[model samples]
Target: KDGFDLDLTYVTDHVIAMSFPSSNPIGEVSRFFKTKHPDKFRIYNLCSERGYDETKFDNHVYRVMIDDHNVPTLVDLLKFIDDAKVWMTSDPDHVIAIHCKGGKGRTGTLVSSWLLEDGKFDTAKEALEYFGSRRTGDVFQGVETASQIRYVGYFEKIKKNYGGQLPPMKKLKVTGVTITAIQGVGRGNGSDLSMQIVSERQEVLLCKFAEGYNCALQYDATDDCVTCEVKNCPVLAGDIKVRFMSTSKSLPRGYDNCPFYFWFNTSLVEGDHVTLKREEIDNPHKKKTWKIYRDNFTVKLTFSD
Candidate 1:
């Protein structure tokens, strides 16, 4: 086991959370699956861009790209596990592989949320403690960070408020914002990718390059009509982080590479219209050029009573 530690523990019949030594190379991941867990076909890599590789696995791999010491956006986090649920239900034999740097904070937060969502645990603390007991580490240490703990609380609140159901994503009135590619180049090139519009840590998946030139969110069809509806409405007031989601193989640095997925932050308000453009910038560390799309990516918002 030169490159493989495989510190995996089962939280459920099909869901496993694990951590591999950082010294282990990406190729070790493939060996792990091939050797021990070939049946665990779905791999969810939660590490950041600096330490992990996205393309090493031949089986289905979903990269959530969590910042090393940070939590994921609520939208992204829910979608990830929800997708895992889909896979597990579709194939009774399927097992899921989930990892973060040490398989602690980020991993625990998500696993605990799933437990609560699945109705296996009545409280966040119970879910987290159950995981710690099974995984065996510092007590209350897996669910480490304050934010991560709060995320569990948030999930509980959402579940209770919606009567054991997730809140439905409602249509938010959009206006005064149009995102356009400023570079002279077009699609089919290495840079072709989708854009994620995250408002106050809630992501509204706006566009997908593979799906053609259209925003995934609801949009209007009229003159000067760059309007769209967003989920997770009543979007809290805070900085909006706009990020690129690389869905193309021709990317210069490959999928989920630092340059391929970049974030720009801005503020927003209700009824305020703005036009945003994507601009290319030099990556000081690399010879490659990176695009900064709407560093100040904000949006107009409206709330209904």
Candidate 2:
């Protein structure tokens, strides 16, 4: 309560989500863990923004790099699950703690993932519900955005259908993307909209604001979906980071465009289609920018081959 917000709540028997621990003035956080498990736990720092003092820990500390509002690569996500499960299986009394900047989004996502992988929940939706119930009691939305929830759902599919391992990473290509109900993100017109996309295996796709499909954009007022016929949209695998932005003669372009973005693994797509809703985006200004519309915005990425 000393000017710091702390969370060290258990999401499951052996897993806990906590605020990042530092040796600075927030001594209560580390102290709580010391009494909670003492010599019987691991702490994982999932925030790539900065590192805490590992020397402050006597047991083990792990660093897994997942950026602020983005999802981890399928490889990275599964590896974390495996590593944690190994420790958890080693000793019945052993525990683990994880944290992002807020110990909410990234933390909840992985916690939910573990819930799915451990067979603790029958479905991803159920796991997410449980995570929200435990994590948010401390408005907290369980795993945060749409695609993050989708990633957890992807994990469930692997466990329930594919026997708990990632299927082949599909070498898929994006034919185009259709964005609908975007009345909230600025003006909902192609004039101000541009997109940037990236993956682990390719260079990048920059659909600059040249206007309309010339910029790989097409606004369908009849349907209210901005169809981005992103020509040469690079082949995708691993994880794809799509940045949707409203640009200007005033703001300049590139990765610093804005916070309107989402990430996904191509193999996770069902029937070569993915629909991300407005609440599913990475917009930090949502409570301020969007006051109307339930769906807010819907972006559908269609793939070929």
Candidate 3:
């Protein structure tokens, strides 16, 4: 907790991709680098959930506040890549050290985006593979989530179609949702289950199956699951978080300690439909949460223009 947990790899000649630095001991990141060298390296801190004391460093770190396991806004992503490009373009000796917690998903997202924007790699997938090959060690995973991977793909689209400029925020309306295998939580039936689909931290849709407020619910015997239609759905954009909670008073009051939840950007959707299996969720524990069995859980979102 005190020492800097370091793992450095050069994804590109000018970018040194690494894991998050230590904060408890204060100057640990600077300690790893020679104190005398100031302009030799600049740090791009991507972890918004935590921060090290800025005074400890030589004022070389640029902090961008992005939550863990979530993608940044389009403006922020473009601006960060743009600043990095300008910095490296102006100086042949200058390099950047980009980091996020554990250095896989978020770090790979940024690294792969830069590779595409700079034309270092022809496609986002290609850049992603290159980063995965270089950055991963134990299990060899990179950009480790669907939404995270899709955001980089979104960047690829922007660079090619929109001239690398931030495009207008496309709105999305959730029409309906279908979920299967509603068991093992909140009375072993779907009655005690409730769901909240949030945009950033705002509740866009809140429904409790037992209460059935502002929503219509139906069940199927053959499918053995529940489906619902939401009324007056809001058109939302960016940083969408989904939580499936138990309305039972004994369980968590809100998002905390929910059995399962996941997030995705509205912009990351390929079309008007999004479907996910058990493994693709946030905390897909085999025994405790998801992946308990095949088709144990599925979430299908139908969207409208």
Candidate 4:
């Protein structure tokens, strides 16, 4: 050991692949690795939003916080990657298996970045696609995976080579993105939430319909079981129907108790440029209490060529 900057370590031919954060129980890993790799490899496992062990670190396997279930500091993650890089390059025949909670998103990002650093990968997007081909999942193809790729790209470029090359990025413009809210149609029962967009040139751009409200009260799968109906009149073409299942759940909340889940299917397409909104209903039987839940969107189905 010359110093802290450069310290030589031992060598081994074993390798270990694992999910980050160690949230999942290692029983599956222990059994599988013991059977498959035996004396050549080990495994580390993790799950999302849970807890596990990571104190044991020999030559076979090691665990880290790269998955970042608890939102770790950037410095710590970079340090861990640095340590792993040294460990991987120290031995030529060393097989170091890396995995995330799902073995795709975070883990793919880490490995892809490692590959790029080692001159094996040309772009982070290609690496992500490679990961997807190996593992199967939609989350690995969404913003979560993109976020991981971006983090590593940012870190690697700044640390390894800070030349005239700009960083990799995907830019999007949201200047014309307008959102409107309508209530009081179907009494929060008969597709009361709807949305329509009439562009500056009087061209119908977007239309949405829901059970209760489309702004904040959409179908949420986690807590509130909100259902909604979003319809576009302009795209109907008289016979074509377009309906989508837009549900969201933030987690840790009551299952199907989401605040967004308030819409449901109730009607069919009728016309183009349909301005579906809401209207107040007059109830002579009930007192003013009936008006409390009388919030919904009315459907005005109409369109233009």
Candidate number achieving the greatest lDDT relative to the actual structure: 2
| Candidate 1 Cα misplacement greater than 4 A, ranges | 1-4, 20-25, 51-55, 137-139, 163-305
Candidate 4 lDDT by residue in tens digits, 1-305 = 21122111111233333444332345544444445445443333323344444333234544444433111123444555565667666765445565555554455555555555555556655655554544443324411322354445544554456441333322211111111232221222223323333222242433333433223334332322233333333322111111222232211111122111111111111223323222211111123323432233222323333
RMSD of 4: 17.4
How far residue 224's Cα lies from its native spot in candidate 1, in Å, is 54
The whole-model C-alpha lDDT of candidate 1 against the native structure comes to 0.55
- What is candidate 3's lDDT per residue for 170-254, written digit by digit as tens? 6788777777775544454467776788875678888776667756777775777778776677887876777777756533332
Q: Per-residue lDDT for 1-305 in model 1, tens only?
A: 56556677888877788884354455666777767656556888777654444445664778786765446766676687588778777877787878887788778888888888778988888888888887773325556544466567667776777554445544333322333332222232213555555664466545553444443333333321223333333343333444455544433442234233323212212234333222222121122333422342222333332
- Against the reference, the lDDT scores of all candidates come to 0.55, 0.72, 0.71, 0.36
**Shift in Å, residue 51, candidate 3:** 1.6
Give, for candidate 2, the lowest lDDT window spanning 10 residues: 248-257
**Model 4 lDDT, residue 276, Cα:** 25
Clashes of each: 2, 2, 0, 39
TM for candidate 3 is 0.80
Task: Write the residue-wise lDDT of candidate 2 on 49-126 in tens digits.
Answer: 888667566647888788776678878888898998898889899998888878888888898898887888888788
The true-versus-predicted C-alpha distance at residue 263 of model 1, in Å, is 18
Ranking by lDDT: 2, 3, 1, 4
lDDT of 4 at 228: 36
